[PDB]
Amino acid sequence: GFPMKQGVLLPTRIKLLLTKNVSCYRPRRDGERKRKSVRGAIVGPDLAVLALVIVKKGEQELEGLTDTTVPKRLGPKRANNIRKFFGLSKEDDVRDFVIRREVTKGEKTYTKAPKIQRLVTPQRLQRKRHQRALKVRNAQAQREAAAEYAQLLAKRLSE
Amino acid sequence: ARGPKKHLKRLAAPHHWLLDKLSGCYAPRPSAGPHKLRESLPLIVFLRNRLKYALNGREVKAILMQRHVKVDGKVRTDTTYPAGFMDVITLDATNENFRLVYDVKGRFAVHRITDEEASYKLGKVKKVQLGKKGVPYVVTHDGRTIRYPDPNIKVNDTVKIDLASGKITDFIKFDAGKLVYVTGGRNLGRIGTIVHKERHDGGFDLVHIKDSLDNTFVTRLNNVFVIGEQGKPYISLPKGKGIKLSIAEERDRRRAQQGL
Amino acid sequence: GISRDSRHKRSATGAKRAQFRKKRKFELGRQPANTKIGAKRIHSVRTRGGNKKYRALRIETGNFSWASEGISKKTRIAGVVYHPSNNELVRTNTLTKAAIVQIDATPFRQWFEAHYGQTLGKKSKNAERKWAARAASAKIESSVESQFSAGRLYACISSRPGQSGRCDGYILEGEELAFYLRRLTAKK
Amino acid sequence: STELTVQSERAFQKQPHIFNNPKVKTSKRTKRWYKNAGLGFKTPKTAIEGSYIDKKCPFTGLVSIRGKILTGTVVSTKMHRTIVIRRAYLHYIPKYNRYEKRHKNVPVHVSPAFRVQVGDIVTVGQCRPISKTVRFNVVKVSAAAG
Amino acid sequence: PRAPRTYSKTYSTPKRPYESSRLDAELKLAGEFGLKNKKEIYRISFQLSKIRRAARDLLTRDEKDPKRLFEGNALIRRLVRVGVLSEDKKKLDYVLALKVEDFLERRLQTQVYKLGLAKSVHHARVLITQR
RNA sequence: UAUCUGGUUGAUCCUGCCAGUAGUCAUAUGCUUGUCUCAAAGAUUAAGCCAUGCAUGUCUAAGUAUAAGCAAUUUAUACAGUGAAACUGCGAAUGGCUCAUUAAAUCAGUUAUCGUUUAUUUGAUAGUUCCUCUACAUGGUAUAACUGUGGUAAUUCUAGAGCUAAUACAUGCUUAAAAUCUCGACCCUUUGGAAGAGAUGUAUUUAUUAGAUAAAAAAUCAAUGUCUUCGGACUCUUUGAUGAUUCAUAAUAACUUUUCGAAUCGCAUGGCCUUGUGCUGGCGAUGGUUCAUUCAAAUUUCUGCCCUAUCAACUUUCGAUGGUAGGAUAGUGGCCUACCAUGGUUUCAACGGGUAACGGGGAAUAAGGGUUCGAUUCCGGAGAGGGAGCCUGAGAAACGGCUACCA
RNA sequence: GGACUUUUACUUUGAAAAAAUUAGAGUGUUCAAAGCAGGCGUAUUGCUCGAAUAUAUUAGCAUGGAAUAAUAGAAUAGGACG
RNA sequence: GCCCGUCGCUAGUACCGAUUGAAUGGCUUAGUGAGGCCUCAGGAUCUGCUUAGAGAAGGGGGCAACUCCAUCUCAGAGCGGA
RNA sequence: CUCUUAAGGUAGCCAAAUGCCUCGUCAUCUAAUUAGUGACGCGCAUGAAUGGAUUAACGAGAUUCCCACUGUCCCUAUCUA
């Protein structure tokens, strides 16, 4: 049952200290390492299965494989990621491009679509307007009271 | 103990809340906030132990979650928020304006002030510092920092703050004579003038005091909270004016007021 | 691992101590960054409460300051010459605080000869105006001047490379340079 | 027992960040930073017209005096730049309504400013861990006997 | 981790278990006030002792002592409110001469009898404990 | 609540024990047992071993919904309700249990941080980012759940192929005016002057500087600052906290595998005029750098422990006491390392040994003084079968975390 | 007028000082052990007293005292006061 | 009358004692040394910058000439990261 | 108390280089010991300068065991003069 591990070499099972972002191990809590068994990277006869990936296609067709083909499941969801998919440009308004899929109830079928994220909206532009306002306004106001005090200070001296 | 503590065993809580002995193992335990947790007062204890506006601690939250209560003008919603001295608390939906200010025992009395006055408080300054970019600032006893202060303001002097703008609006210095509130110790709840400050280099200056009855008591500089001029308070003192009477004189005032 | 605790020590009376508790992390210590000379290699180390420290363990080029001339220039650091703590640091050429190292002199040359318009012991108008004023002030020590001929300057390291990651120092002047000079011909 | 000719240690002996420009001829060959200790302790002449270094000196150095100001008699000067003070007292045993003579030895740093010997009532002041045993620092020194 | 719901005991058995003298006197008492056992006298004998002690201590103090006057008159005012101390025997000297039957008399038991209602303490017993 | 009595003689008075007497927040055991209130309870011996179940998880209006989920309608052809799963965030360092270790340790009262770290709460705090033709009407990759191909007897095991999100990961624009600086084309020779070119956020690291004072007057050298009546003159000139600092804070020259300086979310739907989906604009949420506050932590000053000499010298092994420098740490420090000295404790009991020893708040015993006890409702400490090591995080040398040896 | 013991012990009075426990004030848990409650009234939109006080015998800190008991000082004068 | 010691029987207790006696714990000389941590390396697989040649874009602005930014596609030649 | 024949084995020590029975009995050491040691003693037939008991040091003396060691052995092989 034990999985081969990328580039251990050897043709035998061993036990490594595995971590996060490492194959053959999903951490059950943050910082949890685990001594787990693992199979080598070299092919021996002790293999139950052996995954291969096809690089160059050969002479004849492979019935389950070359012949048939299967679709992706999800389409693009980000603004530009939709743009990039169909090849649009910055000013092309993705909204009318997003993938929609039909769902059948009993007698009322309907379609649905993502929720274009990262999409520039009237709302977003209003938020940037606020941040800008607050920053410059608060700066001037902080300079208002700055000189205001410095003059209140001179009259602790000049008098 | 591997980190900060999160519980309060009901017995290790401050006595001046007057929670019962039985009826549970734990006390509220003030959250982190404006006042030191031992010197504070949770809103749960005010709103159900001190006002009886609630019974369950559940109904405490339900009141708070209604935003029914401001502290110093800002609407606070943490069940165990740590309110304290000079704070205001405003239950709007019933036209009530209080001010957590001391008993004559050492407790937080239910002191009701007007719909005005709640528009300000007082603040004992703790430090006066030169901040960065040359800006100066003071720090008051409730974790308020006010940048650009009156150069006259030194440490221990009190400060008249607004309550919707910050900003100091006049203040009082610490010299002989001033009217002083004791904020802890054996004389917590008492009020009086000054007479003397006995400074001690190395540490701990004591401040002799005299009330409006020619009784002289002493405390540590730490506990003294100036609140105005002789016979002239900058706020409304609770009943009894924090004058303190003996158990003898107590008993007489009881039986005499008792009957008729 | 390492523990900076005092419990494992003896009492001054000389009495031994039974172990009171196991080791806590908040008394730990770490192994030295022994910072050698070479291509820049720095690793960081997560310290108490967020906070980064910088394990500089390979350094050429530090930022040094000619103290009297009021400026600073980043040089290269040739080798380690002396070390009051341990000569092994010297032999393996190891950079610590209070190290005494030889650094490039050419960035300090290019400043002097252009700030003052002079050469170290062998046009335009405002250029001459400046030089003329800056003169009668631009003669330095002969114990410092003659060093430029070799192209390497005696300097002392004031940073803490296992901590900051920088090997910043200051070129030896005054009696300080006088003192380390004396020590450099008695032994080296 | 003896104070070095300053530059005795393999490292150069100087006060941190007290610089004197070589391009500027003066009177004193080397500047001298000293401070006033506090609590009305008068800094000695020796702490000023000296070239001793001592980064653990109350004046002229990088320590400070806060906490407890103690006093005991000198019992061992045999160390270097630190001594042993004895602090005598009387513990009270309630049962016998009486007392017993106890004593403590308290290691203290002694600046080169003071030239102190066994005898000598001494006034030390607390000052952060200087060095394992040592936690206090000579600050004032009352006479011997003659 | 709760709070120790405090308590204390009420009586105090005699130092000497068999005093024909003492045992007689105790039995006389148990019969005229109609008690149930010796514990009901031990309870009162003990109560009496603290009172006499409390007063024994207050009297050693200098008179007009702030604590003596408060804690004494408070003691006296309580003893009178129950019918054990005479209306004008309001002195600590007179509470040290107080004895067991003073207390014993004021029981509901010997009140249900002492004013009609019963015509017997043993009758009065059952009358009280039967609502 | 200041008490005694029985037993040595043939008899007497003493010494002197034993025995009686009385209580025990004192445990067990025996016999007996109706009512009310209150309610301790596998500490003692074995910190001995543990079957099985449970004890830590968590969502707002407000980070991520293309469930081939459900309700259904929305005005909804981007999304819009409710929402499995999964990612992101926070918590899991609190609690609860026990008393094994521990005798100058812990603990107590009392200090110290002018010797440090601190998620969070609370109050403050950011016009400077590019550059001698730039996305800002908004940059770029990847992954889970899912899909399908699977392995193993077995577990909170997971492989390889395919998809797609972010407040995840990685990138990256932006803003007024002045001023002070350095480099200096050039012009005109005098008291000589400059055209515009670059530099100036914060944080990082190093050096240098300011951060004045108890009371007063000149002389010059050095480099240059106002002026006027062009001879020479110069006044009213500024600086904070502490018992004390190289303090706060500012400045100069630079340094940097460059820290931060909002590419985020919910409600609201307003106002201007050249009417463009133009400009402005409300109430919050969540972030954020630095300081303050708070909840803390870590060390720390003084004094205080039971039996013991059939324990009198101990300590420097292989750091014991100190000095100098360094390294290390969040920081002080023989904490560690080099070099240097020979110091440090002790009959006022060191050192060692024993304890059926966690410290204290307190408990039992009532003339007073004392005697004995404290595993155990609160506080502090320590530990999670024994040791050591460590990942994560603000915090753990954590065990309902991991790694190893041992049992 | 502020600081002020040659250096102490002692003694007075205060200060900082957890709660529970103990001592002890009030209160009719029906009594009591307890608890910290509660009490009055037009009881149909109310009023009101409380939750004291004492104890800490060591040490530290602040303070009034100078009896008792310790201690220093001018003898080759290397003395005091200005 | 009282009374002392050997000797004699029974039971109990401690002591001495071959066994280079035994057990548990603490601390240890010598030799051996797991693991994670730090470090010199290693480099299954990944990947940022730069450069010439090629194909397809749009103009920084012209009667023919001239010249930037961004995106992405395959021989290479460099220096870097995980 | 008695007889032989003058006394009648004391202090000590032992299956001892002296014990027949005998490979004594108990204990210890071993898997197992006619061995060794510690004990016991009616000792065929120990015993006091015919010297008795103890004894540190010494021994190419006799005897047991442990560690180390090793071709003594299991079990033999190979090489040189």
PDB file of N, CA and C (backbone and C1' of nucleotides) in Angstrom, chain F residues 334-346:
ATOM      1  P     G F 334      29.406  37.586  32.996  1.00  0.00           P
ATOM      2  O5'   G F 334      29.319  36.007  33.138  1.00  0.00           O
ATOM      3  C5'   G F 334      29.395  35.388  34.414  1.00  0.00           C
ATOM      4  C4'   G F 334      29.108  33.913  34.332  1.00  0.00           C
ATOM      5  C3'   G F 334      29.147  33.188  35.667  1.00  0.00           C
ATOM      6  O3'   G F 334      28.218  32.108  35.651  1.00  0.00           O
ATOM      7  C1'   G F 334      30.904  32.397  34.260  1.00  0.00           C
ATOM      8  P     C F 335      26.645  32.407  35.820  1.00  0.00           P
ATOM      9  O5'   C F 335      26.037  31.990  34.406  1.00  0.00           O
ATOM     10  C5'   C F 335      25.279  30.802  34.259  1.00  0.00           C
ATOM     11  C4'   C F 335      25.002  30.489  32.808  1.00  0.00           C
ATOM     12  C3'   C F 335      26.195  30.096  31.955  1.00  0.00           C
ATOM     13  O3'   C F 335      26.568  28.745  32.140  1.00  0.00           O
ATOM     14  C1'   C F 335      24.845  31.634  30.773  1.00  0.00           C
ATOM     15  P     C F 336      28.108  28.328  32.259  1.00  0.00           P
ATOM     16  O5'   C F 336      28.626  28.358  30.761  1.00  0.00           O
ATOM     17  C5'   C F 336      28.172  27.411  29.813  1.00  0.00           C
ATOM     18  C4'   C F 336      28.647  27.767  28.433  1.00  0.00           C
ATOM     19  C3'   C F 336      30.143  27.977  28.280  1.00  0.00           C
ATOM     20  O3'   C F 336      30.852  26.758  28.123  1.00  0.00           O
ATOM     21  C1'   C F 336      28.999  29.782  27.290  1.00  0.00           C
ATOM     22  P     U F 337      32.414  26.654  28.489  1.00  0.00           P
ATOM     23  O5'   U F 337      33.108  27.607  27.431  1.00  0.00           O
ATOM     24  C5'   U F 337      33.095  27.296  26.046  1.00  0.00           C
ATOM     25  C4'   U F 337      33.949  28.265  25.273  1.00  0.00           C
ATOM     26  C3'   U F 337      35.258  28.646  25.938  1.00  0.00           C
ATOM     27  O3'   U F 337      36.263  27.660  25.788  1.00  0.00           O
ATOM     28  C1'   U F 337      34.178  30.593  25.187  1.00  0.00           C
ATOM     29  P     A F 338      37.769  27.947  26.267  1.00  0.00           P
ATOM     30  O5'   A F 338      38.376  28.701  25.001  1.00  0.00           O
ATOM     31  C5'   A F 338      39.768  28.905  24.849  1.00  0.00           C
ATOM     32  C4'   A F 338      40.075  30.331  24.490  1.00  0.00           C
ATOM     33  C3'   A F 338      41.001  31.027  25.459  1.00  0.00           C
ATOM     34  O3'   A F 338      42.342  30.652  25.275  1.00  0.00           O
ATOM     35  C1'   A F 338      39.187  32.450  24.984  1.00  0.00           C
ATOM     36  P     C F 339      43.119  29.982  26.496  1.00  0.00           P
ATOM     37  O5'   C F 339      43.810  31.242  27.161  1.00  0.00           O
ATOM     38  C5'   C F 339      44.399  32.225  26.325  1.00  0.00           C
ATOM     39  C4'   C F 339      44.416  33.578  26.983  1.00  0.00           C
ATOM     40  C3'   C F 339      44.751  33.585  28.457  1.00  0.00           C
ATOM     41  O3'   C F 339      46.129  33.445  28.714  1.00  0.00           O
ATOM     42  C1'   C F 339      42.888  34.958  28.089  1.00  0.00           C
ATOM     43  P     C F 340      46.594  32.697  30.054  1.00  0.00           P
ATOM     44  O5'   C F 340      46.240  33.750  31.195  1.00  0.00           O
ATOM     45  C5'   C F 340      46.871  35.018  31.203  1.00  0.00           C
ATOM     46  C4'   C F 340      46.176  35.984  32.125  1.00  0.00           C
ATOM     47  C3'   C F 340      46.200  35.648  33.597  1.00  0.00           C
ATOM     48  O3'   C F 340      47.450  35.902  34.192  1.00  0.00           O
ATOM     49  C1'   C F 340      44.054  36.390  33.006  1.00  0.00           C
ATOM     50  P     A F 341      48.231  34.718  34.938  1.00  0.00           P
ATOM     51  O5'   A F 341      48.445  35.321  36.391  1.00  0.00           O
ATOM     52  C5'   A F 341      47.715  34.810  37.492  1.00  0.00           C
ATOM     53  C4'   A F 341      46.872  35.865  38.157  1.00  0.00           C
ATOM     54  C3'   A F 341      46.305  35.451  39.503  1.00  0.00           C
ATOM     55  O3'   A F 341      47.216  35.652  40.562  1.00  0.00           O
ATOM     56  C1'   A F 341      44.562  36.276  38.163  1.00  0.00           C
ATOM     57  P     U F 342      47.770  34.375  41.352  1.00  0.00           P
ATOM     58  O5'   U F 342      46.565  34.011  42.329  1.00  0.00           O
ATOM     59  C5'   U F 342      45.920  35.044  43.061  1.00  0.00           C
ATOM     60  C4'   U F 342      44.658  34.572  43.733  1.00  0.00           C
ATOM     61  C3'   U F 342      44.829  33.424  44.719  1.00  0.00           C
ATOM     62  O3'   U F 342      43.881  33.584  45.769  1.00  0.00           O
ATOM     63  C1'   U F 342      43.292  32.805  43.059  1.00  0.00           C
ATOM     64  P     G F 343      44.047  34.738  46.875  1.00  0.00           P
ATOM     65  O5'   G F 343      42.777  35.672  46.632  1.00  0.00           O
ATOM     66  C5'   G F 343      41.497  35.321  47.137  1.00  0.00           C
ATOM     67  C4'   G F 343      40.457  35.262  46.045  1.00  0.00           C
ATOM     68  C3'   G F 343      39.054  34.860  46.487  1.00  0.00           C
ATOM     69  O3'   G F 343      38.287  35.945  46.986  1.00  0.00           O
ATOM     70  C1'   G F 343      39.697  33.543  44.640  1.00  0.00           C
ATOM     71  P     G F 344      37.642  35.892  48.459  1.00  0.00           P
ATOM     72  O5'   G F 344      36.323  35.032  48.270  1.00  0.00           O
ATOM     73  C5'   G F 344      35.327  35.409  47.334  1.00  0.00           C
ATOM     74  C4'   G F 344      34.296  34.321  47.188  1.00  0.00           C
ATOM     75  C3'   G F 344      33.828  33.688  48.490  1.00  0.00           C
ATOM     76  O3'   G F 344      32.845  34.450  49.165  1.00  0.00           O
ATOM     77  C1'   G F 344      34.391  31.986  46.969  1.00  0.00           C
ATOM     78  P     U F 345      32.881  34.558  50.762  1.00  0.00           P
ATOM     79  O5'   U F 345      32.274  33.172  51.231  1.00  0.00           O
ATOM     80  C5'   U F 345      30.921  32.871  50.931  1.00  0.00           C
ATOM     81  C4'   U F 345      30.511  31.539  51.487  1.00  0.00           C
ATOM     82  C3'   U F 345      30.825  31.306  52.949  1.00  0.00           C
ATOM     83  O3'   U F 345      29.950  31.970  53.842  1.00  0.00           O
ATOM     84  C1'   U F 345      31.459  29.408  51.719  1.00  0.00           C
ATOM     85  P     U F 346      30.506  32.471  55.266  1.00  0.00           P
ATOM     86  O5'   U F 346      30.852  31.136  56.054  1.00  0.00           O
ATOM     87  C5'   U F 346      29.842  30.200  56.379  1.00  0.00           C
ATOM     88  C4'   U F 346      30.418  29.023  57.110  1.00  0.00           C
ATOM     89  C3'   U F 346      31.184  29.338  58.379  1.00  0.00           C
ATOM     90  O3'   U F 346      30.331  29.579  59.477  1.00  0.00           O
ATOM     91  C1'   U F 346      32.392  27.770  57.096  1.00  0.00           C
TER      92        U F 346
END
